Write an enzyme that holds these catalytic residues in place. Structure first.
Site, PDB file in Angstrom:
ATOM      1  N   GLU A  11      -2.273   6.484   6.066  1.00 53.48           N
ATOM      2  CA  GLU A  11      -1.394   6.836   4.933  1.00 53.48           C
ATOM      3  C   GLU A  11      -1.628   5.941   3.710  1.00 53.48           C
ATOM      4  OE1 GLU A  11       0.620   9.310   4.715  1.00 53.48           O
ATOM      5  OE2 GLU A  11       1.489   9.847   6.656  1.00 53.48           O
ATOM      6  N   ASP A  20       1.574  13.943  -1.754  1.00 50.65           N
ATOM      7  CA  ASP A  20       0.781  13.773  -0.556  1.00 50.65           C
ATOM      8  C   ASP A  20      -0.199  14.952  -0.410  1.00 50.65           C
ATOM      9  OD1 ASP A  20       2.599  15.728   0.320  1.00 50.65           O
ATOM     10  OD2 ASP A  20       3.553  14.496   1.860  1.00 50.65           O
TER      11      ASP A  20
END
Ligand SMILES: [Cl-]
Ligand SMILES: [Cl-]
Ligand SMILES: [Mg+2]
Length: 162
Positions: A11, A20
């Site tokens: 991440e 994202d």
């Protein structure tokens, strides 16, 4: 290596609002702010999550706090879902970490929807489960965040993070 280090690799860590790979407003280590298309709702959600007026920016310590909360939420999410829990409990230690990672990334609902993959994992059909995950929208739109998790499900070792 451990689940925290694993997710920190997949991440990464960012201190301002970004989209994202799913297209949702996100900050810190993969922290989902909202699925709302509206940046104001994300900004208000960042302030709500932190307890102060952040104006889109956070500290490293605030991110690490959000991160502990989010990994704890992923584990609790798995255990409290009737489809996920028996599968999870059948997994060895390393594959359990791939399972937490997948939920942290995609959420419970998303993961629980993949009925056939769950049965493949419970039946220890690692190659088939991995072939199937590599055909999901998650892999196709998030290949860099997903690739190592899928390999981890295949092999049951930490090697993809080395
Ligand atoms: Cl084990
Ligand atoms: Cl990606
Ligand atoms: Mg456990």
């Amino acid at each position: 290596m451990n689940i925290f280090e694993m997710l920190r690799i997949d991440e990464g860590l960012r201190l301002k609002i970004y989209k994202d790979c799913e297209g949702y407003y996100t900050i810190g280590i993969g922290h989902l702010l909202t699925k709302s298309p509206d940046l104001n709702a994300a900004k208000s959600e960042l302030d709500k999550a932190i307890g102060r007026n952040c104006n889109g920016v956070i500290t490293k310590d605030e991110a690490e706090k959000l991160f502990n909360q989010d990994v704890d939420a992923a584990v609790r999410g798995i255990l409290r879902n009737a489809k996920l829990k028996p599968v999870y409990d059948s997994l060895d230690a390393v594959r359990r970490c791939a399972a937490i990672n997948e939920v942290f990334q995609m959420g419970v609902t998303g993961v629980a929807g993949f009925t056939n993959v769950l049965r493949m994992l419970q039946q220890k059909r690692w190659d088939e489960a991995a072939v199937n995950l590599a055909k999901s929208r998650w892999y196709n739109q998030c290949p860099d965040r997903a690739k190592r998790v899928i390999t981890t499900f295949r092999t049951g070792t930490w090697d993809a993070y080395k």
